[PDB]
């Protein structure tokens, strides 16, 4: 039918202008030259580090990446940080500067940029789902499969809808980080609002979670020396009773939060469509 | 009937807590236990 289709070049290329950098632009490269196996000698990336990262906060690694061990759990200030990538080959260390090189391809820009940690920045995303139901109580069905529905927040920086989530703090696990970000962003808890049972309902909601995927993010802040990799945690409400007690109200770095149907035409931040695909694949839902 | 198929003891416990407001958890447990023990015999209760 299509002739010279030539497979499907699915490769991700980040946008030219780096977000919140004041107009600093990367070195452009077409999508057919990205993988690290091909040589590509005409490669001149730009070294850029954000002033916030360069001011040295608690969540930022030191500017000299020497003596740091990757691919294993490393202790920084007595707190454990993961540093292992989901890529089968692993992370290879450049001999000249000691900085890690991104195994998922070139992005045309070195340095850390907006990311505080060298190498793998582990992020946790929380997909809280429920079946999309009509008033009468019957679950809506499209393409012979039952339709899911997830909580989505509108991001502060670019005003495009996304899955709630954030970077894992030092000395903490994916479980607390996922739960803490969901209360902070989707419910605005803390920065005592809801009390007693509602918390108990939420606890019931949080007692059954499944890690559905651990993938590489197509995040525009990714560089050649710092990239985001996500662990996705799905909280599914089969009955829908616990999900109905959630009073959605945008807080912290989220403007608005709402329940949104899952389909293939969704325009979300980074590779969250792939994450939603994994959630619907696991639950045999429509996508 | 089907509307009453989603009814659970947990939601009943929350309803008891929101209406009577007990001071202690043991008092609520005793109050529910008494309430559930009252409707044990279906003949003796008629709901209008």
């Amino acid at each position: 039918v299509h002739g010279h289709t030539a497979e499907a070049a699915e490769w991700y290329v980040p946008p030219e202008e780096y977000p919140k950098s004041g107009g600093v632009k990367r070195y452009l490269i077409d999508a057919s030259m990205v993988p690290l196996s091909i040589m590509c000698p005409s490669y001149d990336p730009v070294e850029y580090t954000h002033p916030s990262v360069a001011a040295q906060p608690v969540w930022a690694d030191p500017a000299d990446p020497r003596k740091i061990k990757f691919n294993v759990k490393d202790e920084v200030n007595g707190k454990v940080v993961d540093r292992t990538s989901c890529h089968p080959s692993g992370i290879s260390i450049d001999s000249n500067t000691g900085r890690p090189i991104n195994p998922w391809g070139r992005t045309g820009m070195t340095g850390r940029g907006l990311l505080g940690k060298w190498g793998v920045n582990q992020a946790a995303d929380t997909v809280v789902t429920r079946w999309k139901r009509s008033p009468d109580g019957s679950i809506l069905e499209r393409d012979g499969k039952k339709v899911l529905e997830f909580v989505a927040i509108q991001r502060q920086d670019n005003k495009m809808w996304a899955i709630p989530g954030g970077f894992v703090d030092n000395g903490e696990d994916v479980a607390l980080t996922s739960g803490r970000e969901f209360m902070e962003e989707a419910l605005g808890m803390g920065t005592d609002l809801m009390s007693a049972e509602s918390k108990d309902s939420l606890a019931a909601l949080f007692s059954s979670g499944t890690i559905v995927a651990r993938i590489y993010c197509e995040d525009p802040r990714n560089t050649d020396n710092a990239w985001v990799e996500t662990t996705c945690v799905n909280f599914h409400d089969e009955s829908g009773r616990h999900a109905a007690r959630l009073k959605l109200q945008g807080g912290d770095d989220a403007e608005h939060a709402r329940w949104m149907m899952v389909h293939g035409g969704l325009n979300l931040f980074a590779s969250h469509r792939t994450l939603l695909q994994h959630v619907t694949s696991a639950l045999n839902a429509y996508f | 009937l089907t509307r009453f198929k989603s009814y659970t003891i947990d939601d009943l416990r929350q309803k008891v807590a929101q209406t009577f407001n007990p001071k202690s958890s043991q008092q609520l447990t005793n109050l529910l236990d008494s309430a559930l023990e009252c409707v044990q015999d279906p003949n003796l209760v008629v709901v209008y």
């Binding site: 994916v174 949080f206 979670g209 499944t210 | -």
Partner: peptide
């Protein structure tokens, strides 16, 4: 409605309660 309902219910573990 009852058949439809009896029909609706007929069709790594992580604990995040610490948050």
């Amino acid at each position: 409605i009852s058949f439809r309902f009896s029909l609706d219910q007929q069709a790594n573990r992580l604990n995040s309660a610490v948050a």
